[PDB]
Design a protein around this ligand. Sequence first.
Ligand SMILES: CN1CCC[C@H]1CCn1cc(C2=C(c3c[nH]c4ccccc34)C(=O)NC2=O)c2ccccc21
Ligand SMILES: *SCCCC(=O)N1CCN(Cc2cccc3ccccc23)CC1
Ligand SMILES: [Cl-]
Ligand SMILES: [Cl-]
Length: 277
Amino acid sequence: KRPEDFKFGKILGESFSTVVLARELATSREYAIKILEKRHIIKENKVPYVTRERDVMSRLDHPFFVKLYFCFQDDEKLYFGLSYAKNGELLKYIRKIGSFDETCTRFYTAEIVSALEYLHGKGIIHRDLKPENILLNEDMHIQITDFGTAKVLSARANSFVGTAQYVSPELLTEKSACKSSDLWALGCIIYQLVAGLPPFRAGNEYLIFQKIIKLEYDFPEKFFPKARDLVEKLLVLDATKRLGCEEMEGYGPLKAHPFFESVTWENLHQQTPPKLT
Ligand SMILES: CN1CCC[C@H]1CCn1cc(C2=C(c3c[nH]c4ccccc34)C(=O)NC2=O)c2ccccc21
Ligand SMILES: *SCCCC(=O)N1CCN(Cc2cccc3ccccc23)CC1
Ligand SMILES: [Cl-]
Ligand SMILES: [Cl-]
């Protein structure tokens, strides 16, 4: 595919990339085109993010994931053609409506779990999962994105990445990520859906790091009991003891948690999501 094939429309967002809403003229398909300046990627020292983003997304084929449909270049630019998620970031919705009812919390948590199971199945660790990175398409189904910081396992691995609010303990104290590290993030995300704020809150990132390793957070009073129960089984310092990790026997037990007991798992992507709170 060539640049000339697209209208480059509204700039959807702008650090070392600009994401534009593009329309392929002949098919009228919309894509989110990520535009990168080769030279600026070099000077900011972000080539690893780009190559890694490409490698990982090229392995993904699942409804709950943004897909990499095409890549092209010209003399000064790199163009990534991605799935366009028209409804933007999960984060926007939590800020907008405050916190989700249990029906919505349950459904979206289910889709994220379903997504993680697939990702981890292919031996990939996201490492930076968060509401900003969980997008909603036109059908209001999730589409995860931002794989630049991901890791392909050969287990565990070594790297220095994350977002303070969702970073797992093991990343901070062993400088190593595993699949269970994503389950920690999931725990933080469920909490935030229900409470309307992330669980670990402090004066700065280092202080946030301290909360995390201290397991220092609180459930407000209105927290759905079964969700509280699930969150406690995910926010566990010992990475080998989180619900859904390999030592805990995997996703079977995670999906069997009472919080999910009503969920119809196999065709989540084909169900009309619940009206958002
Ligand atoms: C740079 N950003 C703006 C705010 C947060 C961050 C966006 C997170 N994000 C959103 C992405 C995507 C999309 C976006 C939809 N609305 C946006 C607004 C700003 C930036 C991106 C998007 C999308 O349609 N498909 C996507 O894959 C995306 C694709 C690759 C890496 C990170 C991404
Ligand atoms: S769109 C087709 C795929 C492009 C692609 O995979 N890559 C790999 C990452 N680089 C690194 C890079 C970036 C900027 C300038 C470069 C000059 C020479 C060699 C690599 C460069 C290229 C695009
Ligand atoms: Cl948005
Ligand atoms: Cl909006």
